[PDB]
From Swiss-Prot:
Gene: PHOT2
Top-level division of the source organism's lineage: Eukaryota
Residues of the full protein shown: 388 to 491 of 915
Domain PAC: 64-105
Tissue note: Expressed in leaves, stems and flowers, and to a lower extent in roots. Present in guard cells (at protein level).
Summary of the function given for this chain in its UniProt record: Protein kinase that acts as a blue light photoreceptor in a signal-transduction pathway for photo-induced movements. Triggers the phosphorylation of AHA1 and AHA2 C-terminal penultimate Thr in guard cells to activate them and induce stomatal opening in response to blue light (BL). Also phosphorylates BLUS1, a kinase involved in stomatal opening. Mediates calcium spiking of extra- and intracellular origins in response to blue light. Involved in hypocotyl phototropism.
Organismal lineage: Eukaryota, Viridiplantae, Streptophyta, Embryophyta, Tracheophyta
Protein name: Phototropin-2
Organism: Arabidopsis thaliana
Length: 116
C-alpha cells in the first residue's frame, strides 16, 4: 500500500522529522536530506489557514490525535490540499516517544465548506 508519512521525535528540539516515507518525498518533491531534522511546518506557506495550524499545535500540546485539511507547498511551490492525520506514539510506560503524521493529497472537503 502507498503510505505518505513522517515520524517526528518530540524529545528533540522543535519536534524534528526522523523518518520520511518514499511517497512523502515524492508528494513534497523534497529529498530525504532536505527533510530529516526539520519541523514539518516547512510545508506551510502563505495560503495555509493559521486557524488549522493552531488546531495542530493544540493537538501536539495535549498529545491527542487530530485530522485537519490544510494547504501545503511542494519544493517547486505547487499548492496541494493535505488531509493530515496526527497520532501520538507512546512507549511501554505510557511516555510519549514519537508522533506519526500521515498525509493524503487532495481537496477531500470542498474549500467552501472547510471555510465555514
Ligand atoms: C509527525 C508530524 C507530521 C506533521 N506533518 C505535517 C504536514 O504534513 N503538514 C503540515 O502543515 N504540518 C505538519 N505537522 C505540523 C507542524 O510540524 C507543526 O506542529 C504545526 O504547524 C503547529 O506548530 P507551529 O504552530 O509551531 O508550527 C506535522 C507535525 C508532526 C508532529
Amino acid at each position: 500500500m502507498e503510505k505518505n508519512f513522517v515520524i517526528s521525535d518530540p524529545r528533540l528540539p522543535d519536534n524534528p522529522i526522523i523518518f520520511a516515507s518514499d511517497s512523502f518525498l515524492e508528494l513534497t518533491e523534497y529529498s530525504r536530506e532536505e527533510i530529516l531534522g526539520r519541523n514539518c511546518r516547512f510545508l506551510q506557506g502563505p495560503e495555509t489557514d493559521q486557524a488549522t495550524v493552531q488546531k495542530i499545535r493544540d493537538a501536539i500540546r495535549d498529545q491527542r490525535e487530530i485530522t485537519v485539511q490544510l494547504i501545503n507547498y511542494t519544493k517547486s511551490g505547487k499548492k496541494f490540499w493535505n488531509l493530515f492525520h496526527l497520532q501520538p506514539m507512546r512507549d511501554q510506560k505510557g511516555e510519549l516517544q514519537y508522533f506519526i503524521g500521515v498525509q493524503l493529497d487532495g481537496e477531500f472537503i470542498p474549500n467552501p465548506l472547510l471555510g465555514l
